[PDB]
Design an enzyme around this catalytic site. Structure first.
Site, PDB file in Angstrom:
ATOM      1  CB  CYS A 110      -0.945   0.134   1.133  1.00 34.56           C
ATOM      2  SG  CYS A 110      -0.573   0.632   2.758  1.00 34.56           S
ATOM      3  CB  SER A 319      13.172  12.639  29.794  1.00 35.13           C
ATOM      4  OG  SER A 319      11.957  13.034  30.270  1.00 35.13           O
ATOM      5  CD  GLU A 775     -17.192  -5.621   0.121  1.00 42.04           C
ATOM      6  OE1 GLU A 775     -16.245  -6.125   0.773  1.00 42.04           O
ATOM      7  OE2 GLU A 775     -18.160  -6.048  -0.485  1.00 42.04           O
ATOM      8  NE  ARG A 853     -16.730 -15.617   0.486  1.00 42.97           N
ATOM      9  CZ  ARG A 853     -16.325 -16.242  -0.525  1.00 42.97           C
ATOM     10  NH1 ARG A 853     -15.489 -17.441  -0.221  1.00 42.97           N
ATOM     11  NH2 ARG A 853     -16.596 -15.845  -1.526  1.00 42.97           N
ATOM     12  CD  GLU A1234     -11.511 -12.181   0.563  1.00 41.56           C
ATOM     13  OE1 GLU A1234     -11.934 -12.664  -0.449  1.00 41.56           O
ATOM     14  OE2 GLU A1234     -12.408 -11.778   1.228  1.00 41.56           O
TER      15      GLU A1234
HETATM   16  C1  LIG Z   1       4.880   4.456  21.432  1.00 39.17           C
HETATM   17  C2  LIG Z   1       5.077   4.760  22.934  1.00 39.17           C
HETATM   18  C3  LIG Z   1       5.345   3.727  23.859  1.00 39.17           C
HETATM   19  C4  LIG Z   1       5.891   3.774  25.254  1.00 39.17           C
HETATM   20  N1  LIG Z   1       6.218   2.861  25.897  1.00 39.17           N
HETATM   21  C5  LIG Z   1       6.384   2.674  27.021  1.00 39.17           C
HETATM   22  C6  LIG Z   1       6.804   1.707  27.782  1.00 39.17           C
HETATM   23  O1  LIG Z   1       6.865   0.298  27.361  1.00 39.17           O
HETATM   24  N2  LIG Z   1       7.095   1.606  29.316  1.00 39.17           N
HETATM   25  C7  LIG Z   1       6.710   2.876  29.950  1.00 39.17           C
HETATM   26  O2  LIG Z   1       6.804   2.851  31.163  1.00 39.17           O
HETATM   27  N3  LIG Z   1       6.208   4.088  29.292  1.00 39.17           N
HETATM   28  C8  LIG Z   1       6.022   4.064  27.968  1.00 39.17           C
HETATM   29  N4  LIG Z   1       5.710   5.046  27.404  1.00 39.17           N
HETATM   30  C9  LIG Z   1       5.743   6.253  28.058  1.00 39.17           C
HETATM   31  C10 LIG Z   1       6.368   7.707  27.785  1.00 39.17           C
HETATM   32  O3  LIG Z   1       7.222   7.216  26.623  1.00 39.17           O
HETATM   33  C11 LIG Z   1       7.530   7.611  28.887  1.00 39.17           C
HETATM   34  O4  LIG Z   1       6.780   7.691  30.114  1.00 39.17           O
HETATM   35  C12 LIG Z   1       8.298   8.865  28.728  1.00 39.17           C
HETATM   36  O5  LIG Z   1       9.527   8.603  29.503  1.00 39.17           O
HETATM   37  C13 LIG Z   1       8.070  10.262  29.119  1.00 39.17           C
HETATM   38  O6  LIG Z   1       9.014  11.081  29.059  1.00 39.17           O
HETATM   39  P1  LIG Z   1       8.841  12.493  28.127  1.00 39.17           P
HETATM   40  O7  LIG Z   1      10.279  13.255  28.263  1.00 39.17           O
HETATM   41  O8  LIG Z   1       8.385  12.359  26.692  1.00 39.17           O
HETATM   42  O9  LIG Z   1       7.935  12.995  28.885  1.00 39.17           O
HETATM   43  P2  LIG Z   1       6.695  14.573  28.832  1.00 39.17           P
HETATM   44  O10 LIG Z   1       5.719  13.980  28.570  1.00 39.17           O
HETATM   45  O11 LIG Z   1       7.498  15.674  28.273  1.00 39.17           O
HETATM   46  O12 LIG Z   1       6.300  14.788  30.373  1.00 39.17           O
HETATM   47  C14 LIG Z   1       5.966  13.627  30.983  1.00 39.17           C
HETATM   48  C15 LIG Z   1       5.409  14.055  32.494  1.00 39.17           C
HETATM   49  O13 LIG Z   1       6.523  14.234  33.183  1.00 39.17           O
HETATM   50  C16 LIG Z   1       6.778  15.929  33.584  1.00 39.17           C
HETATM   51  N5  LIG Z   1       8.065  16.125  33.682  1.00 39.17           N
HETATM   52  C17 LIG Z   1       8.980  15.683  32.786  1.00 39.17           C
HETATM   53  N6  LIG Z   1      10.050  16.096  33.118  1.00 39.17           N
HETATM   54  C18 LIG Z   1       9.934  16.490  34.738  1.00 39.17           C
HETATM   55  C19 LIG Z   1      10.890  17.000  35.846  1.00 39.17           C
HETATM   56  N7  LIG Z   1      12.296  16.776  35.254  1.00 39.17           N
HETATM   57  N8  LIG Z   1      10.269  17.248  36.926  1.00 39.17           N
HETATM   58  C20 LIG Z   1       8.998  17.279  37.004  1.00 39.17           C
HETATM   59  N9  LIG Z   1       8.250  16.824  36.316  1.00 39.17           N
HETATM   60  C21 LIG Z   1       8.674  16.488  34.783  1.00 39.17           C
HETATM   61  C22 LIG Z   1       5.709  16.500  32.836  1.00 39.17           C
HETATM   62  O14 LIG Z   1       5.527  17.723  33.273  1.00 39.17           O
HETATM   63  C23 LIG Z   1       4.825  15.397  32.421  1.00 39.17           C
HETATM   64  O15 LIG Z   1       3.613  15.522  33.606  1.00 39.17           O
HETATM   65  C24 LIG Z   1       5.346   4.992  26.007  1.00 39.17           C
HETATM   66  C25 LIG Z   1       5.041   6.087  25.168  1.00 39.17           C
HETATM   67  C26 LIG Z   1       4.722   5.999  23.894  1.00 39.17           C
HETATM   68  C27 LIG Z   1       4.311   7.035  23.149  1.00 39.17           C
HETATM   69  O1  LIG Z   2     -18.016 -13.356  -1.124  1.00 36.63           O
HETATM   70  C1  LIG Z   2     -17.588 -12.199  -0.881  1.00 36.63           C
HETATM   71  N1  LIG Z   2     -18.352 -10.962  -0.954  1.00 36.63           N
HETATM   72  C2  LIG Z   2     -17.873  -9.682  -0.441  1.00 36.63           C
HETATM   73  O2  LIG Z   2     -18.694  -8.625  -0.863  1.00 36.63           O
HETATM   74  C3  LIG Z   2     -16.326  -9.490  -0.178  1.00 36.63           C
HETATM   75  N2  LIG Z   2     -15.743  -8.672   0.484  1.00 36.63           N
HETATM   76  C4  LIG Z   2     -14.533  -9.298   0.845  1.00 36.63           C
HETATM   77  O3  LIG Z   2     -13.504  -8.468   1.394  1.00 36.63           O
HETATM   78  N3  LIG Z   2     -14.401 -10.477   0.659  1.00 36.63           N
HETATM   79  C5  LIG Z   2     -15.709 -11.004   0.181  1.00 36.63           C
HETATM   80  N4  LIG Z   2     -16.275 -12.024  -0.221  1.00 36.63           N
HETATM   81  S1  FES Z   3       2.807  -1.407   2.773  1.00 29.60           S
HETATM   82 FE1  FES Z   3       3.034  -1.224   5.053  1.00 29.60          FE
HETATM   83  S2  FES Z   3       1.126  -0.495   5.845  1.00 29.60           S
HETATM   84 FE2  FES Z   3       0.776  -0.984   3.592  1.00 29.60          FE
END
Ligand SMILES: Cc1cc2nc3c(=O)[nH]c(=O)nc-3n(C[C@H](O)[C@H](O)[C@H](O)COP(=O)(O)OP(=O)(O)OC[C@H]3O[C@@H](n4cnc5c(N)ncnc54)[C@H](O)[C@@H]3O)c2cc1C
Ligand SMILES: O=c1[nH]c(=O)c2[nH]c(=O)[nH]c2[nH]1
Ligand code: FES
Ligand SMILES: NC(=O)C1=CN([C@@H]2O[C@H](COP(=O)(O)OP(=O)(O)OC[C@H]3O[C@@H](n4cnc5c(N)ncnc54)[C@H](O)[C@@H]3O)[C@@H](O)[C@H]2O)C=CC1
Ligand SMILES: O=c1[nH]c(=O)c2[nH]c(=O)[nH]c2[nH]1
Ligand code: FES
Lengths: 1300, 49, 98, 49
Positions: A110, A319, A775, A853, A1234
């Site tokens: 895609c 952070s 669809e 189906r 499919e």
């Molecule tokens: C795709 C994704 C995956 C993630 N995976 C995980 C994961 O696996 N595990 C996990 O635990 N978390 C996860 N997180 C959460 C997040 O990434 C973390 O908590 C990150 O460490 C936040 O840090 P930041 O600098 O982006 O915070 P910000 O969003 O900038 O701030 C976060 C909070 O901390 C405050 N703050 C920041 N620094 C300070 C400071 N020095 N003193 C006081 N307050 C402060 C801010 O005011 C705010 O309230 C994920 C997030 C995303 C988007």
């Molecule tokens: O028999 C089907 N009809 C549909 O309208 C459809 N749409 C789809 O994603 N697969 C199928 N199969």
């Molecule tokens: S080629 Fe990766 S989402 Fe479609």
């Protein structure tokens, strides 16, 4: 000051009025017009918005490069950096090696995820020009792809790795010259010498201060404690976008040196609180490599959590302090910091305190013991001491980038030279509204020896101390409790091993070697892949590309970000934005609507409701849906109206100011609720053959049971989008839509407006995925936007946010099935009765055809003489469910394999022998009386069972299971038969229109839409063969209702078959007209014949058309053929489960698939892999949860876990069946989209085998024919592995979610 | 001629494969297409008038 | 169309040819991607040439609807069309004249 | 044609024509043109692909 100055692809940007609410993604797309960077989710999970940042790092003194999510990067955080987007590295005139390799390796279908994957790979190379295979995989933890099944992307990029007939030729890839990358902007090097000064930016609602010094931050926080710190924005951006929190004053302290420093002390390493997690990772990795093991136990625990923490893009800006202060109950870091007693330094203007993180640091939900004027300065992660051991644990729904169900840090300190506990700390996330310590349990173990009594004491303690209410947020109470005990067991065994390595083996005992695998840290063998397909004949012209592995025609443009999707089209200067307003109740009267707050939002235009519909408010395939709700709402997500404003931001704010008052009405949510209320779409559907009562009477054995199958979100990376352009004359309107169904889009718009179809044109260039979700359900956006454009006389646009799309547009149908099967001791099946129920939601849509189906496939591959299947579609107060790739087939066939699995177990016979002996043979009739001709399934079976070495592997699985107590392997081989053609006969039609211009170039169009399946590629291949000219002379630009009318949706896997025939016929018409000119100049080129025809006044335009012949099944007479032909294939899959967590590895999968004489083996193998991986998701990872009041909980990639790069079979082999032409479809091909998806059930049944082995191992009781519903998630796997831990953890009663 | 509407063209590039759509006040769509395609060195099949 | 009422005349021609009212027929525009290789609208001849083209395209549609008109000689145009669609008969045609 | 709304990113073009019936072009100076706000480029024969 107040000017924001940065660079994008080497060009200086000077933004005199930066709004703090503006993200880099929106600035790139809307302000600068660079639309290669995409919106896929807005929450950091999908990586579609990945870009590279370069800056001069004053602290390290050098130019650095890292990736970020543009969707979460405030532009106000980016002063004096240099952004690189996909457009900055290359274009189709000069592709960057990364762009070239992903395109040519068939790594782009895609194409919507391609730019972001390109930028992840590009950033890695800028940092490490000779990466390892492992480093390459890690580069993509933050990138999702729904189409490709990931294999080709990794295989293409393996060519960059220092340790790295065919589908592509890596020898033709051009080499990388790193000196040719973009210069670091010289101005930024000059500015590096200027001191950083404090900046202030003011937006519509928000003030941003970029603090330069600690004194400025502390002063600000004393004067204005409400000032909200933002560092990485990876939490605050979510709070603002999705939880509608508004912080009017933000301070960003990222520049301050004290918050960014790393100090090595005697007790440990102190990280400034603003240090990114990428820097924590690099520092701790270096320290772990050079320091003795004895000192790095806590470091290794932190590293283990960081391994599964988001991807590179998040870690580069997230952070360490941000994670701590966010104080989520499911922080992966806080349990580790709590267990290790990490030292936090807190400061305010004039104050400074240090605290050990302990229970008291986290009083209540998302609170800490910081004062409002305090900030976190630093955290010291400690060295471990002699006799001190540490483990960290996490279990989620998916390993990579997922929210913990339970997460933990565990620490023990022994009295020197003993195995006696001096200190024990067990800390958990996911078990309370905060990070907790098991403070009642651990004191009791002080001075105990590390032994079986301590293990039993701690487990009983944990079971009592870590109680969860039935209504605990996130559900899975039994699972979560089981994990606390299971993690502790792992720690217990690990510490035995660690004591052993310190020479106390004689005191604590050695580990039983069948237990060792329980303590291993997760690791995967490097991947190994095979693609086998058939060479075309030697005599085939080099210009005949049919059967050759031609790359998708748009791959280079998708890799370069030049391919245009709907929202990439430039806005008209007068264009408006639309936002849907949806029901927050499952079933209610609308008592009133108050738009007073909406009207105050700047740029607000109007709020559309049913009263604004010019003609008919009745829409939907069966005319039972509202355009806009009238008097009552019938699901959470029911569209009540639409706000029109100047900008998307204003439309969002105005939609929030539309206040709806409801009066609740009795809601029907679940299949059971529907059964109880007799709430169905139409009559029972039934297929029966033979004599049921007789078959059951003759059966040696009879087994009854039920199976539940969860639904599925499409998660097309490009959500639903429409642009409607009114023409101001005669009701004419043109719509640009991400849809598989131009005809129904046009019909539904015309009906709503009350104008003829001839006034409405619907155009589709491409979709970023559809999968059946576009669809029909695209039209709910299209109709709303069309009305807006009609009413205003202005172009109007709407692209759904992911949360909106996931709520409104529905998914695959959940199924409940009740089965009874009769069989002989030999495994031969003689009787089957199955009652199927689906949850259709609040409009009919495609639900009845989906059930038909399912019934057509309740046999799967098996001849059953006495058979009865019923289906009922439940009508419920949920979003309407719709087509999803498979269209009921996967549900029907999973039920068949499920009772088939129980037949084999009941008979005590090898499952492959039982399946084989029940398989149809050539010439047999199905239960619906269709004859199976050209029945290739036995060949697929024999080829797969031999090439996979299934029997020898069975031996190795049995050996592994006898030698491991706490990990088990499983192995299963599963066949499939899939009927090709729409179940509604007249939809099996298609058309084309071809023009030859006087330069000889050919413009082709057909009814099919491109959604990543390479349909246009195939149609060009077909046309080039038919006309005997090179593909280079033929172009397809788009799909349009005003070039080919009355088209069926691009669906039922059939679009290449139907449109290929129409293209072929149009081409034959042109060739017939050119014949006299060919006869006079048999040598002279194509161009001469064309110009001769033209100057002879011969038409060079033709239509083509095809209908599939001889179709039409009757449910009343059980006769006539629903299908033109069938697809066949077989997959053998092997898994290894973790019996203590419910995690598993997909070790190996081997597929043999009958695609006839493939039109394009690269595209077809890509369809097999992509379909298989969506099925892997359906059966093992993807799960939607709903409140008891029918509100979807699961609305983004944070909670909805589709397969990741790391999810696919480690060894992944695909073969296309040789020597199997299907001459009744175009050029002897078969449809492919499919049929392969169901083959991922092989992983489900391999899991089921491994659980069976686990249940034989532990549990004193067994219970044969145990229940495994789909999806077989870690929860379901872990809960089925009954043992001493599940025993200690085991109405009515409110809960977080309900089974729908 | 003094047509009340003078000559006017809007050309909208599509960024893919040399594709371009033109909205033109013309009596001659074919020669418009041909002449644009030849100037740009792209096939006629990329140019819509 | 340049003010000479060519689309008007072609709708008049199509309505006679199909035996349906002008109200049911619409011309939106002229485009190289719907009809290729066209002569300029010139030489006073554009209604002559395009009228013949339109007439032939319409005759092709009529020939395709003939069986459905036979089965329902009174039933309206809309019934013949929908019957042709659900019988999988093409409702698109080109027309040409020299 | 000109009644069609402009795209947000749409540019405007103006032809530069000969003020002589028959002459060699000795030189062309675009220094003053380049100073006009919003100037993008001056296309000549050398720009034809
Ligand atoms: C795709 C994704 C995956 C993630 N995976 C995980 C994961 O696996 N595990 C996990 O635990 N978390 C996860 N997180 C959460 C997040 O990434 C973390 O908590 C990150 O460490 C936040 O840090 P930041 O600098 O982006 O915070 P910000 O969003 O900038 O701030 C976060 C909070 O901390 C405050 N703050 C920041 N620094 C300070 C400071 N020095 N003193 C006081 N307050 C402060 C801010 O005011 C705010 O309230 C994920 C997030 C995303 C988007
Ligand atoms: O028999 C089907 N009809 C549909 O309208 C459809 N749409 C789809 O994603 N697969 C199928 N199969
Ligand atoms: S080629 Fe990766 S989402 Fe479609
Ligand atoms: N985006 C991603 O992929 C990831 C994000 N993160 C984190 O996930 C967070 C999700 O935020 P929210 O959805 O608001 O969830 P949240 O911060 O409220 O945590 C929800 C979880 O907290 C627990 N919980 C809360 N109250 C409870 C109670 N009373 N009893 C028992 N358990 C309770 C449960 O474990 C529940 O699933 C983000 O803020 C981020 O910090 C972590 C990993 C991956
Ligand atoms: O014989 C003609 N040829 C033309 O190309 C033309 N153009 C036109 O305006 N009138 C005429 N007549
Ligand atoms: S759009 Fe940014 S991560 Fe998905």
């Amino acid at each position: 000051a107040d000017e924001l100055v940065f660079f994008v692809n080497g060009k200086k940007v000077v933004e005199k009025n930066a709004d703090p609410e503006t993200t880099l993604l929106v600035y790139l797309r809307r302000k600068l017009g660079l639309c290669g960077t995409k919106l896929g989710c807005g929450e950091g999970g999908c990586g579609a918005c990945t870009v590279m940042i370069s800056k001069y790092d004053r602290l390290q003194n050098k130019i650095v490069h890292f990736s970020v999510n543009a969707c979460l990067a405030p532009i106000c955080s980016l002063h004096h950096v240099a952004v690189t987007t996909v457009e900055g590295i290359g274009n189709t005139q000069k592709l960057h090696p990364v762009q070239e390799r992903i395109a040519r390796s068939h790594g782009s279908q895609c194409g919507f995820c391609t730019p972001g994957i390109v930028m992840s790979m590009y950033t890695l190379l800028r940092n490490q020009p000779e990466p390892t295979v492992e480093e390459i995989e890690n580069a993509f933890q933050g990138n999702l792809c729904r189409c490709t099944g990931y294999r080709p992307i990794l295989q293409g990029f393996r060519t960059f790795a220092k340790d790295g007939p065919s589908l592509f030729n890596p020898e033709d890839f051009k080499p990388l010259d790193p000196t040719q990358e973009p210069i670091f902007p010289p101005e930024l090097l000059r500015l590096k010498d200027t001191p950083q000064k404090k900046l202030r930016f003011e937006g519509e609602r928000v003030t941003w201060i970029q603090a330069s010094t600690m004194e400025e931050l502390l002063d600000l926080k004393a004067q204005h404690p409400d000032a909200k710190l933002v560092v990485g924005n990876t939490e605050i951006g979510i709070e603002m976008k999705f939880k509608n929190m508004l912080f009017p004053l933000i301070v960003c302290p990222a520049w301050i040196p004290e918050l960014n420093s790393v100090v090595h002390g005697p007790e440990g390493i102190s990280f400034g609180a603003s240090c990114p997690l990428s820097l924590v990772e690099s520092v701790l990795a270096e320290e772990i490599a050079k320091l003795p093991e004895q000192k790095t136990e806590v470091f290794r625990g932190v590293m283990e959590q960081l391994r599964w923490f988001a991807g590179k893009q998040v870690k580069s800006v997230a952070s360490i302090g941000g994670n701590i202060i966010t104080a989520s109950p499911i922080s992966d870091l806080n349990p580790v910091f709590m267990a290790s007693g990490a030292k936090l330094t807190l400061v305010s203007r004039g104050t400074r305190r240090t605290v050990r993180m302990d229970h008291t640091f986290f009083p209540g939900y998302r609170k800490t013991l910081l004062r409002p004027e305090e900030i976190l300065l630093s955290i010291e992660i400690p060295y471990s001491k002699e006799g001190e051991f540490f483990s960290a644990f996490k279990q989620a729904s998916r390993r990579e980038a997922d929210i913990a169900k339970v997460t933990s840090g565990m620490r023990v300190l022994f009295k020197p030279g003993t195995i006696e506990v001096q200190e024990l700390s067990l800390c958990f996330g996911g078990m309370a509204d905060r990070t907790i310590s098991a403070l009642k349990t651990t004191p009791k173990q002080l001075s105990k020896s590390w032994n079986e009594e301590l293990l039993q004491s701690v487990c009983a303690g944990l079971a009592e101390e870590l109680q969860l209410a039935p209504d605990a947020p996130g559900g899975m109470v039994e699972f979560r409790r089981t994990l606390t005990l299971s993690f502790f067991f792992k720690f217990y065994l690990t510490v035995l091993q660690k004591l052993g390595r310190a020479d106390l083996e004689d005191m604590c005992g050695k580990l039983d070697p069948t237990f060792a695998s329980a303590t291993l840290l997760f690791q995967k063998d490097p991947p190994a892949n095979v693609q086998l397909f058939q060479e075309v004949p030697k005599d085939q012209s080099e210009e005949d590309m049919v059967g050759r592995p031609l790359p998708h025609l748009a791959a280079n443009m998708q890799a370069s970000g030049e391919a245009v999707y709907c929202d990439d089209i430039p806005r008209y200067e007068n264009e408006l934005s639309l936002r849907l307003v949806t029901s927050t109740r499952a079933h209610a009267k609308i008592t009133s609507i108050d738009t007073s707050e909406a009207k105050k939002v700047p740029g607000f235009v109007c709020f559309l409701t049913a009263e604004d519909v010019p003609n008919s408010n009745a829409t939907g395939l069966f005319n039972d849906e509202t355009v806009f709700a009238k008097d009552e709402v019938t699901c959470v997500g029911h569209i009540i109206g639409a706000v029109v404003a100047d900008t998307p931001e204003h439309a969002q704010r105005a939609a929030r100011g539309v206040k709806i008052t409801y009066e609740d009405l009795p809601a029907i949510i679940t299949i059971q609720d529907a059964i109880n209320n007799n709430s169905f779409y139409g009559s029972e559907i039934k297929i029966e053959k033979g004599d049921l009562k007789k078959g059951f009477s003759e059966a040696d054995n009879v087994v009854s049971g039920e199976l539940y199958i969860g639904g599925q979100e499409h998660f097309y990376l490009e959500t639903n989008c429409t642009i409607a352009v009114p023409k101001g004359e005669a009701g004419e309107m043109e719509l640009f839509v991400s849809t598989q169904n131009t005809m129904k889009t046009q019909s539904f718009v015309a009906k709503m407006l009350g104008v003829p179809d001839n006034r409405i044109v619907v155009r589709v260039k491409r979709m970023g995925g559809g999968f059946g979700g576009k669809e029909t359900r695209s039209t709910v956006v299209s109709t709303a936007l069309a009305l807006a454009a009609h009413k205003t006389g202005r172009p109007v646009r709407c692209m759904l946010d992911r949360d909106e799309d996931m709520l409104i547009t529905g998914g695959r149908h959940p199924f409940l099935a009740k089965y009874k099967v009769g069989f002989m001791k030999t495994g031969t099946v003689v009787a089957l009765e199955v009652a199927h129920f689906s949850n259709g939601g609040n409009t009919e849509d495609l639900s009845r055809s989906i059930m038909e189906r399912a019934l057509f496939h309740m046999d799967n591959a098996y001849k059953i003489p006495n058979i009865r299947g019923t289906g009922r579609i439940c009508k419920t107060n949920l979003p309407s469910n719709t087509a999803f790739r498979g269209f009921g087939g996967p549900q029907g066939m999973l039920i068949a394999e499920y009772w088939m699995s129980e037949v084999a177990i009941t008979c005590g016979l090898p499952a492959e022998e039982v399946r084989r002996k029940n398989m149809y043979k050539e010439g047999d009739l199905t239960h619906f009386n269709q004859k199976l001709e050209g029945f290739t399934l036995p060949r697929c079976w024999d080829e797969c069972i031999a090439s996979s070495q299934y029997l020898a592997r069975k031996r190795e699985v049995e050996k592994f299971n006898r030698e491991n107590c706490w990990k088990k392997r499983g192995l299963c081989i599963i066949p499939t038969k899939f009927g090709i053609s729409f179940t509604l006969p007249f939809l099996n039609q298609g058309g084309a229109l071809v023009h030859v211009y006087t330069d000889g170039s050919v413009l082709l169009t057909h009814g099919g839409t491109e959604m990543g399946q390479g349909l246009h590629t195939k149609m060009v291949q077909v046309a080039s063969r038919a006309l005997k000219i090179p593909t280079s002379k033929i172009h397809i630009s788009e799909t349009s209702t005003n070039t080919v009318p009355n088209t069926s949706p691009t669906a039922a896997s059939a679009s290449a078959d139907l449109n290929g025939q129409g293209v072929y016929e149009a081409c034959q018409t042109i060739l017939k007209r050119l014949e006299p000119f060919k006869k006079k100049k048999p040598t002279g080129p194509w161009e001469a014949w064309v110009m001769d025809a033209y100057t002879s006044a011969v038409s060079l335009s033709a239509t083509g058309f095809y209908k599939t012949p001889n179709l039409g099944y009757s449910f009343e007479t059980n006769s006539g053929n629903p299908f033109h032909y069938f697809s066949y294939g077989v997959a053998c899959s092997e898994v290894e489960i973790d019996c203590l967590t419910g995690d598993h590895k997909n070790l190996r999968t081997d597929i043999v698939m009958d695609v006839g004489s493939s039109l394009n083996p690269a595209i077809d193998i890509g369809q097999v892999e992509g379909a298989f991986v969506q099925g892997l998701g359906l059966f093992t990872m993807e799960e939607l949860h709903y409140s008891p009041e029918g509100s979807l909980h699961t609305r983004g990639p944070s909670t909805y876990k589709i397969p990741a790069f790391g999810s696919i079979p480690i060894e992944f082999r695909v073969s296309l069946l040789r020597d199997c032409p299907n001459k009744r479809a175009i050029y002897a091909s078969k449809a492919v989209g499919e049929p392969p998806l169901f083959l991922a059930s092989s992983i489900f049944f391999a899991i089921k085998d491994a659980i069976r082995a686990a249940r034989a191992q532990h549990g004193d009781n067994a219970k044969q024919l145990f229940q495994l519903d789909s999806p077989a998630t870690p929860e379901k796997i872990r809960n089925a592995c009954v043992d001493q831990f599940t025993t200690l953890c085991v109405e009515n009663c409110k809960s977080w979610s309900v089974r729908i």
